[PDB]
Fold this sequence. Notes:
The structure is a homodimer.
Chain A lengths: L4 E5 L5 H11 L10 E6 L5 H12 L6 E7 L2 H4 L5 E4 L6 H19 L5 E4 L4 H10 L9 E3 L2 H15 L6 E2 L2 E3 L7 E3 L4 E4 L2 E4 H5 L2 H5 L1 H7 L1 H9 L4 H17 L7 E6 L12 E9 L2 E4 L7 H23 L4
Parallel strand pairs in A: 1-2, 1-4, 2-3, 4-5, 5-6
Antiparallel strand pairs in A: 7-10, 8-9, 10-11, 12-13, 13-14
Amino acid sequence: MSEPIRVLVTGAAGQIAYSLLYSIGNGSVFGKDQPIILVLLDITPMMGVLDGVLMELQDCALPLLKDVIATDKEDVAFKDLDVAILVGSMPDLLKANVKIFKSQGAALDKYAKKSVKVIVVGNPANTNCLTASKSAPSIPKENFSCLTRLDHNRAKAQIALKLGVTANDVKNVIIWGNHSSTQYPDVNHAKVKLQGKEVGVYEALKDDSWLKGEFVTTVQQRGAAVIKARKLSSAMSAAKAICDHVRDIWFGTPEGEFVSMGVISDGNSYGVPDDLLYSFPVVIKNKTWKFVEGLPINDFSREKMDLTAKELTEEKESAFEFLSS
Amino acid sequence: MSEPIRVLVTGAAGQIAYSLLYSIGNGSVFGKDQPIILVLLDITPMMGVLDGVLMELQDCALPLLKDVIATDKEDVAFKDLDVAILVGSMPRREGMERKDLLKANVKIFKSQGAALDKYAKKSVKVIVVGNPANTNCLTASKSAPSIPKENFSCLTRLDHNRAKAQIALKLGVTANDVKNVIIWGNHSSTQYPDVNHAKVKLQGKEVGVYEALKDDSWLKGEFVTTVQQRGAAVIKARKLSSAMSAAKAICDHVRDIWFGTPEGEFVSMGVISDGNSYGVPDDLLYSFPVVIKNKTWKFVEGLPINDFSREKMDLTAKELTEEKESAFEFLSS
């Protein structure tokens, strides 16, 4: 049994957290040998609901859940953290989110371990993540990431439906750019196992028009479609994606596979502006991600990558006007 | 890989099901080598919500989830089933008792028992969650005479896990170092959370719970009240029922059927009472301590029942007898 790690989930009385906490507490994210001190933060009006969530976690009788703490206070929530999963955001909008993530970045900067891994989920994910990182200069910028793994898994699922295979036989899809409707779901470098053999996804589909059109729109609009159907959030699949994202940080990516993660763009070789939080293909070893270098970018891909970079730059300049406050 | 099994969850557009489906689909219930055909039933105006759930299951990219079927029809939902998890029902709201829902929900379980009787495999395991769970389960079993009555069970594993959690708090250990708690009787306010046969690991030694705590009055009083009222406390706090923890308890209950109970441990399950040696009337669906192997449960025999425990077990048997008569009389009309 390893020494316990301290894991924060914010927005802890909300829908996504409610689908996530059991998977953290049962060992499925950080390993069956890894006890968890679970810290739950939400806003003061949600504290009565959060107490009910705490009761349910107790009632799960989880051996790895060494302690659970419910709080509305940043100095409790961010103390000595190994992992911070920032789910809560505002439901002007950007001004209110800058206030939240400047505050939480500042709390990370003074209360958490300097080795904390910070995974940002609450929308707008990339810009919230960038805001928090700029407000936490003593935390390595590489320790911040935002969730495009749900878009990634959605893309795998759409390819799997078109080909009649399970989504896990699809690998090396890429979500470039913003967790938004301008994201680029790219399969130029993806492979799928068909009848036992790996083949390129474009080769397997024989439908370039679909892959460059309807497939892209379907992934970009998938969250809106789930909300329209369920009237509630897309919490079950978002939680599973967070688990995948955090597990791959913690244990590394499989050999030959890369995954999508919003990370700081500094030094990228793909023509993306520096100082953005932008989703890239990454390989992960020893809890450290590295850009997949050397992927050729065709003209269709380059245009899509630039259009989502444009939106991220726009969000950054609008947000940072509110940064000094 | 084994051949796929077909697993039904009813009330599939609702909250408990939403907390449960991922655990079925990801292999944590039936095993990493067991592919699942997941069958989801709810009512007609909920099929749009269920379409959203199907999209989310797709988006989870689960390799053991071979297929997902969404339906509002019993002849689709109950066909060729290996496992039926009967969640769908009206929940209670703040301030209700679970027995307030008896006449609302037993009509549904009579219909679903009849559907099990003609459409499912005769080897189907039926796990009843919707309230009032014992009497709903008894009703379903009586409507499915061609399925062995031992294949029906109802969920007291959530009460069981709640009881472990309260003992763990009083003794300062993790809830999984508590074993052999028992929930006797009805999943209701007359349930008897019994720790006369429970053991706790304390400083590397196994000790009885009464011996470890040295507070008989708490174990016979506030402990019982806290476990009985826990479901209502969650509803008051969340304004919704306890879906995360109920789903986890369903997983525990079904996993122990599928793989068997751990060595030296027994678990609580509502089962048909016929032939019990604890003074419980026959022909009740009543929670007992059981051990399970080869997917077959057996009563734990020989546990001494003291005067306090006897009184509590008889009071909850009496309530179940009253519920049984209420359901029979209502359904006869």
